[PDB]
């Protein structure tokens, strides 16, 4: 009822902080935290935004019911142009919850066991074109490759065979629609995400009419994923339209690719920058898999603990998801403040995960930080790259399978280096932080 969180003055009448935030969001929220503490509001584009920084505040959002802090109210703008109607934030949460469970069917030890071989092969195949040595763009490569690995692993061999590396460029433009601008403005501007949704939709639509050409009198007794969707029905019983199916396959692919490819690229540069550490990851491959480095198996992954912490530290310093957003529909209180209905409520993993008074040597890439007590273990919500509560990621496990496998394979192929000391800066083009000038030097390993 009572007290609003501290408000941050802007001299710009309706825009508010839209420009400064859009240009440098992290810097902004860090500065805001030092001056206003962990809970504050500011205006952007005639709207009020309340951020919850650090673990104790962020808990309000993470522990929230969707009825009170609503996701789709914010997210539908961003994702409905990308996935299309009928799926995700374009439907009630009870429906989206049903879809979420369909997609979880593919995600268990059974499938992961097969995934590891697919991924290792796709990777090795892909990086032939790099030959023995050079200087190349590793982010473009992983973007291409992970289209292939993700579609193969999650979507099946059939779908995979109709996709190729040109589809990465569709997906860059899909992900291009996850921008400050798209977040805050009505969709009438130079977003070509719509063209790429037209294409990615068509591409995925051929595939239904392919299984459906057989679906008539050919009932598949080969286990697939598109099959699961076509075969499945909602709680109430109704079957998914060809449109629902299609959207969910676009989303599943983006899910497997967008967050993984930026993360994978960053790890590259962190390891290229710290050579001692890259060495040990290589040695770990041998210690764990044997000096003769045979093909990778799912069961080897759980023991690649250093690489595991390298992924963890990358997601700490460069999470692919910088902020999560909800719309307050009912008043809410945190830290002695009341957030009224209408506030957009936000948390930032990026910020939480380098908080000046939580994370010692906050900006250092040190994966050994997890071998002593640290906020990821000793706080509930200081480390949240995959989120928490009712909205959290179903795909963390697959994600780690893909990135470990790709980077296990890649360390076996090459030794990586920076080019004249240059460590990529952050590119805030989109709300998925990619690295600047992501060209890595590489030569043959061993
Ligand atoms: C590094 C890889 C990934 C990261 C960092 C990541 C991160 C996240 C985060 C932070 C959320 C929370 C959204 C929110 O609270 O508003 C989320 C939700 C989700 N992610 Fe991911 N994700 C990744 C990979 C994947 C993969 C591979 C899949 C599917 C196979 C996937 C599917 C989902 C789904 C279905 C949700 C649920 C959204 C909701 O319930 O509102 N993600 N992810
Ligand atoms: C159901 C199918 C159609 C899509 C399922 C995946 C979808 C729920 C996941 C995948 C992409 C995803 C998570 O990584 C993303 C977000 C939350 C949930 C999403 C849409 C969101 C929307 C969370 C908010 C972030 O700021 C940002 C806009 C970058 C991402 C975009 C990607």
Curated annotation (Swiss-Prot):
Query: A Gene Ontology MF term for this entry?
Result: iron ion binding
Q: Where in the cell is it found?
A: Endoplasmic reticulum membrane; Microsome membrane
GO cellular component annotations of the record? endoplasmic reticulum membrane; membrane
Per UniProt, activity regulation is:
Inhibited by azalanstat. Inhibited by azole antifungal agents ketoconazole, itraconazole and fluconazole.
Q: Which reaction does it catalyse?
A: a 14alpha-methyl steroid + 3 reduced [NADPH--hemoprotein reductase] + 3 O2 = a Delta(14) steroid + formate + 3 oxidized [NADPH--hemoprotein reductase] + 4 H2O + 4 H(+); lanosterol + 3 reduced [NADPH--hemoprotein reductase] + 3 O2 = 4,4-dimethyl-5alpha-cholesta-8,14,24-trien-3beta-ol + formate + 3 oxidized [NADPH--hemoprotein reductase] + 4 H2O + 4 H(+); 24,25-dihydrolanosterol + 3 reduced [NADPH--hemoprotein reductase] + 3 O2 = 4,4-dimethyl-8,14-cholestadien-3beta-ol + formate + 3 oxidized [NADPH--hemoprotein reductase] + 4 H2O + 4 H(+); a 14alpha-methyl steroid + reduced [NADPH--hemoprotein reductase] + O2 = a 14alpha-hydroxymethyl steroid + oxidized [NADPH--hemoprotein reductase] + H2O + H(+)
After translation, how is this protein modified? Ubiquitinated by MARCHF6, leading to proteasomal degradation.
Entry's EC annotation: 1.14.14.154
* This protein's pathway: Steroid biosynthesis; zymosterol biosynthesis; zymosterol from lanosterol: step 1/6
The tissues where this chain's protein is expressed are given as:
Ubiquitously expressed with highest levels in testis, ovary, adrenal, prostate, liver, kidney and lung.
- Which co-factor is required? heme
Chief subcellular location: endoplasmic reticulum
From the record, give the cysteines joined by S-S bonds.
none
What the entry lists under Pfam families is as follows: p450
Provide the topology term for how it sits in the membrane: Single-pass membrane protein
Q: Which GO terms describe its biological process?
A: cholesterol biosynthetic process; cholesterol biosynthetic process via 24,25-dihydrolanosterol; negative regulation of amyloid-beta clearance; negative regulation of protein catabolic process; negative regulation of protein secretion; steroid biosynthetic process; sterol metabolic process
Q: Where does heme bind?
A: 393
What InterPro entries is this protein classified in?
A: CYP450_sterol_14alpha_dmase (IPR050529), Cyt_P450 (IPR001128), Cyt_P450_CS (IPR017972), Cyt_P450_E_grp-IV (IPR002403), Cyt_P450_sf (IPR036396)
Arranged from A to Z, the UniProt key words for this protein are: Cholesterol biosynthesis, Cholesterol metabolism, Endoplasmic reticulum, Heme, Iron, Lipid biosynthesis, Lipid metabolism, Membrane, Metal-binding, Microsome, Monooxygenase, Oxidoreductase, Steroid biosynthesis, Steroid metabolism, Sterol biosynthesis, Sterol metabolism, Transmembrane, Transmembrane helix, Ubl conjugation
- CDD domains, per the entry: CYP51-like
Q: State its role.
A: Sterol 14alpha-demethylase that plays a critical role in the cholesterol biosynthesis pathway, being cholesterol the major sterol component in mammalian membranes as well as a precursor for bile acid and steroid hormone synthesis.
Q: Which family does it belong to?
A: Belongs to the cytochrome P450 family.
Q: What is this protein called?
A: Lanosterol 14-alpha demethylase
Which species?
A: Homo sapiens
The encoding gene is CYP51A1
């Amino acid at each position: 009822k009572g007290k609003l969180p501290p408000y941050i003055f802007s001299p710009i009448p309706f825009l508010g902080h839209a420009i400064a935030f859009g240009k440098s969001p992290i810097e902004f929220l860090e500065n805001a935290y030092e001056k206003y503490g962990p809970v504050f509001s500011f205006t952007m584009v005639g709207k009020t935004f309340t951020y919850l920084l650090g673990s104790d505040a962020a808990a309000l959002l993470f522990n929230s019911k969707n009825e009170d802090l609503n996701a789709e109210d914010v997210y539908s703008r961003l994702t409905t142009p990308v996935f299309g109607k009928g799926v995700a934030y374009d439907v009630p949460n009870p429906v989206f919850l049903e879809q979420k469970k369909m997609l979880k069917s593919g995600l268990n030890i059974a499938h992961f066991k097969q995934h590891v071989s697919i991924i290792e092969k796709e990777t090795k195949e892909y990086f032939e074109s790099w030959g023995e040595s050079g200087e190349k763009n590793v982010f473009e490569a992983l973007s291409e490759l992970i289209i292939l690995t993700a579609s193969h692993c999650l979507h099946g061999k059939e779908i995979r065979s109709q996709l190729n590396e040109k589809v990465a460029q569709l997906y860059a433009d899909l992900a291009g629609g996850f921008s400050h601008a798209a977040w805050l403005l009505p969709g009438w501007l130079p977003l070509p995400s719509f063209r790429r949704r037209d294409r990615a939709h068509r591409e995925i639509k051929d595939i239904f009419y392919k299984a459906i050409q057989k679906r008539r009198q050919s009932q598949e007794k080969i286990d697939d994923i598109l099959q699961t969707l076509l075969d499945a029905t909602y709680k109430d019983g109704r079957p998914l339209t060809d449109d629902e199916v299609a959207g969910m396959l676009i989303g599943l692919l983006l899910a497997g690719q967008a967050t993984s490819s930026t993360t994978s690229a960053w790890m590259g540069f962190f390891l290229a920058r710290d050579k001692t550490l890259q060495k040990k990851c290589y040695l770990e491959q041998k210690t764990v898999c044997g000096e003769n480095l045979p093909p990778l198996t799912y069961d080897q992954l759980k023991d690649l603990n250093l690489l595991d912490r390298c992924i963890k530290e990358t997601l700490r310093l460069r999470p692919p998801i910088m902020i999560m957003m909800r719309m307050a529909r009912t008043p809410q209180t945190v830290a002695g403040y009341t957030i009224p209905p209408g506030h957009q409520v936000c948390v930032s993993p990026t910020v939480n995960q380098r908080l000046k008074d939580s994370w010692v040597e906050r900006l250092d890439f040190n994966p050994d930080r997890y071998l002593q007590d640290n906020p990821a273990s000793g706080e509930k919500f200081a480390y949240v790259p995959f989120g928490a509560g009712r909205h959290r990621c179903i795909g963390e496990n697959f994600a780690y399978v893909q990135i470990k496998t790709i980077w296990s394979t890649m360390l076996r192929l090459y030794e990586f280096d920076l080019i004249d000391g240059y460590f990529p800066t952050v590119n805030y083009t989109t709300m998925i932080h990619t690295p600047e000038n992501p060209v890595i030097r590489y030569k043959r390993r061993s």
